[PDB]
Amino acid sequence: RWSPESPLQAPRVLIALLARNAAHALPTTLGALERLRHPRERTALWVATDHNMDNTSTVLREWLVAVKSLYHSVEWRPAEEPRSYPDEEGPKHWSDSRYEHVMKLRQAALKSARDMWADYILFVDADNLILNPDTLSLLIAENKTVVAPMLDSRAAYSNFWCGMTSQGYYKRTPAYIPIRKRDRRGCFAVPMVHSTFLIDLRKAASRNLAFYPPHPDYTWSFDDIIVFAFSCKQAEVQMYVCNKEEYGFLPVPLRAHSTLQDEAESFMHVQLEVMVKHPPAEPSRFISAPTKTPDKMGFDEVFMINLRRRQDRRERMLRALQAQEIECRLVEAVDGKAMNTSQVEALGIQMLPGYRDPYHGRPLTKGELGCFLSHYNIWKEVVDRGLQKSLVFEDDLRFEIFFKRRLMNLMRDVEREGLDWDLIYVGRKRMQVEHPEKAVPRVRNLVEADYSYWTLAYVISLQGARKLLAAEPLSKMLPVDEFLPVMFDKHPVSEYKAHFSLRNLHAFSVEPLLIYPTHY
Amino acid sequence: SPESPLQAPRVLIALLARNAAHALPTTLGALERLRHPRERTALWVATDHNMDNTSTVLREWLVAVKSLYHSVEWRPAEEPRSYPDEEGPKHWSDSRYEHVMKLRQAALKSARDMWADYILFVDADNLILNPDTLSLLIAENKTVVAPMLDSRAAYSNFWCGMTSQGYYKRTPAYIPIRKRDRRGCFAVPMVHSTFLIDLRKAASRNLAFYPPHPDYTWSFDDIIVFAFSCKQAEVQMYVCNKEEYGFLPVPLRAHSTLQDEAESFMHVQLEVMVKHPPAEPSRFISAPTKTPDKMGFDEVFMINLRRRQDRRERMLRALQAQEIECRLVEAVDGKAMNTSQVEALGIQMLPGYRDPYHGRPLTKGELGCFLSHYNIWKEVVDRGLQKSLVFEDDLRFEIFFKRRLMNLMRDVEREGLDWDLIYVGRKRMQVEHPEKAVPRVRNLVEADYSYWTLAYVISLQGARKLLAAEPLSKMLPVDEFLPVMFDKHPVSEYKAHFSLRNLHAFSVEPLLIYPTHY
Ligand SMILES: O=c1ccn([C@@H]2O[C@H](COP(=O)(O)OP(=O)(O)O[C@H]3O[C@H](CO)[C@H](O)[C@H](O)[C@H]3O)[C@@H](O)[C@H]2O)c(=O)[nH]1
Ligand SMILES: O=c1ccn([C@@H]2O[C@H](COP(=O)(O)OP(=O)(O)O[C@H]3O[C@H](CO)[C@H](O)[C@H](O)[C@H]3O)[C@@H](O)[C@H]2O)c(=O)[nH]1
Ligand SMILES: [Ca+2]
Ligand SMILES: [Ca+2]
């Protein structure tokens, strides 16, 4: 008699979470873990926290209490004191006692998974955002013994190495950039994975894996990730990294003598990078992130141009500026296409005689017309209200890490030197890259702006706002990203610089640039 | 790079034990030798209401094997030693039913909480001889599957039918399955005693040993309550008889005794030693010593060829297991005798004898076997043994052999019967009508035509009567000479050679001994 067997229950996963100074990331990080599409009754939690300067253990304790009954089991190993290691130089310094402790901890979680008869153990670093709720299911689907999902960072850094040096050190290989950029998809054999990975405790070879102590043959640096990677070689366990689709994001590690504020702002940029192409990563419905209070970054006004019909560009920028604690005045963009020929003449608008597109040879467009009038209105607002220094934003731009501190420290450097400036580029397209642009003395990270090509973000002074308006550019209409290089006298074509007489604009540019385009 | 093999599935073995010290050495030994990784095996043991030292045997064993297994849970309860609503140790009251259901439910919750793949229930007196039984059960990929355990009777750990009220039901399919005529895994409405639950299956979440399903309207029986639970869960129960798995004692009545259970499980060990080597106990438990008596006889002989070492070791184990002591008599190899030594004893075949089956005359094997019995008949008269039991070396002992045989001889001597021979093992040739019973002596009948000499009781008066006929000059096989002496041999040509056939012969009814191979 045939009788159908019911389905197998999902694999039994232990999620091991080591947390130190993670209160900045846990609301977003733990919310992502809650919403993993894996049955919570087939999931167990293992949490260890210690050496905390922030209220990391308090956030964890509240979250665990809220989700304890949903899971197969929960282990909780806090240690309030000491808040820092006796042999450390700072919270971001990986001393030997911190290496040893974290190794011992991962080993304890590994043993705990073995003792509770779990199929898999999943390590997730407290600052690792597992955005894809299917990541755990997808990693189980690969039937590997140690597999890791390639997480995206702001740079080439990711949670895997492509080469090793037979001494344990990092090593670039030609295949890293292809894997990193997902040009080659799949799962690849690599000598190193870290941060987040899945161990298959069904595999018999996993019984020989060990986070601590180092293997008896280990003769490398006292590094936690190196000790484990060497343990996979001895057990002949091939580590794999998969990039078949997007899984999550992670911040790039900081230097030893960095600070907790660096780390909190570093993870905030991760949230920004997510919001470039995704909705904002939501927090847990049981953890609440602290309320932020913004400012104008010491400016007289921070503008943001936006066309009302581009509603999704508006919400994205407001979420990004809010997350960076930056306040803006929304300026309605001049819809250049909605202006008939009569309203164009009503403002004395005439294209510059003989203008041709640098890459197609076309006259000025209605889009570039409405774009020039948008910046033209802001220049009018600057002169009317007498704002001495203002920052101007557009609606499609991504922010660099530590954007707020980095620009504010330039503005306190430009001010302390009494620089006679009109236009400071926060984001442009540098067109003169043969010889380097002349650096501005006594003001670090600032150069004299040569021929640029964009107006994504810039600082303008009241002096510069009058200079632009006094050149009456409405009758000599030229796209705004070319009219500015005409005003500081670095435009390549001289048939354009001839129509404008006085071109005494003091233009500078932040170096490196603090803002880039979204879709480049 | 090649992925390593998967580990074996995680199995929790659940063991309820009450008054099982008689079986735990042999039973626990069978489990510790299961071909299934101990690191992938966990133990769950609960014991209570013990009148024997069951609790001490388990603790002695668990302490010795704790370090070898993934986990060990241990639930003992010394007081009380019996249920307040019971009529005896073998009576299943509602408190006993309720407690046993709670223990199995507790074992199921344990298996679930420790994330085991399977839970294997094994009754404390179930001898899982086959070390691969666990592996085989897992292989069938069933949610509730049981191995068919052999018993001395038609009883096994499954039913083929069930009534609309939850009672046992015979079906035409039970016997073919029970005798391994139809081999395979069959869907049945009831399995118990030893079975495997697949906790990987989502349906197993709905199984519960306790409490009964809210629709349960049947009797408060532990196995039926579980059976109805799988019905509500739509989980099909299976039993597999593809090969020999293990052995099971047949349950006893509510008013049976502990010694009945102890001796009933001993018979399981005897049954194993028929076609299999002896079932060894755990090398971590000391089996209790046994004191053998002569069962009140003046002597117990065992005939055996010195060359048949295999038969000797098997009998000396079955006897020692039953606390029976025998004097070993070396048989006379009638095949190693040349034609000169045959005449040296004054031996002549009875004129005209031939085998009633293939027509052969008396054989050399049938010669020395008569002489071995002939030499024992002499030692009886020489030593003056009033009552003696005579054994051979290919015997199958019935259940409760020692007590049933002693009770018979006690019923005989208290009645003063003029007896000379009492068969204990034989082939009854009168099968049309039952043989004439002996009044006032239960389980004893007058021996009609019989045909074996497996084992028998012989008196001094009867030991003289055989030798008085002087049979060496007119020799038949010894199993045909006796029916001549009590005058039941159908051949009047043979009986005509013996002038006085005055032997008074009897037999136990039913027989207590049968051959190893029929
Ligand atoms: O004493 C400690 C130190 C760290 N952690 C926790 O362990 C993880 C370490 O992640 P960090 O962000 O603090 O460290 P990095 O981002 O700089 O990168 C890390 O990548 C690996 C972790 O996956 C190795 O730990 C490596 O040495 C280390 O540089 C985090 O979950 C952190 O919260 C602790 O619980 N206790
Ligand atoms: O209070 C108790 C009563 C029983 N048992 C245990 O229950 C198991 C089965 O009991 P028995 O072998 O003594 O009883 P049976 O031989 O008659 O076989 C049983 O077969 C089924 C499955 O075991 C049911 O339990 C049924 O009630 C019963 O007949 C044994 O391991 C016994 O040790 C206990 O641990 N504690
Ligand atoms: Ca990190
Ligand atoms: Ca039993």
Ligand SMILES: [Cl-]
């Ligand atoms: Cl430094």
Ligand SMILES: [Cl-]
């Ligand atoms: Cl320093």
Ligand SMILES: [Cl-]
């Ligand atoms: Cl804002």
Ligand SMILES: [Cl-]
């Ligand atoms: Cl113990």
Ligand SMILES: [Cl-]
């Ligand atoms: Cl049978």
Ligand SMILES: [Cl-]
């Ligand atoms: Cl029955």
Ligand SMILES: [Cl-]
């Ligand atoms: Cl003996």
Ligand SMILES: [Hg+2]
């Ligand atoms: Hg690679």
Ligand SMILES: [Hg+2]
């Ligand atoms: Hg590794």
Ligand SMILES: [Hg+2]
């Ligand atoms: Hg430093």
Ligand SMILES: [Hg+2]
């Ligand atoms: Hg705003």
Ligand SMILES: [Hg+2]
């Ligand atoms: Hg059947």
Ligand SMILES: [Hg+2]
């Ligand atoms: Hg059942």
Ligand SMILES: [Hg+2]
């Ligand atoms: Hg003996």
Ligand SMILES: [Hg+2]
């Ligand atoms: Hg014989």
Ligand SMILES: [Hg+2]
């Ligand atoms: Hg028997």
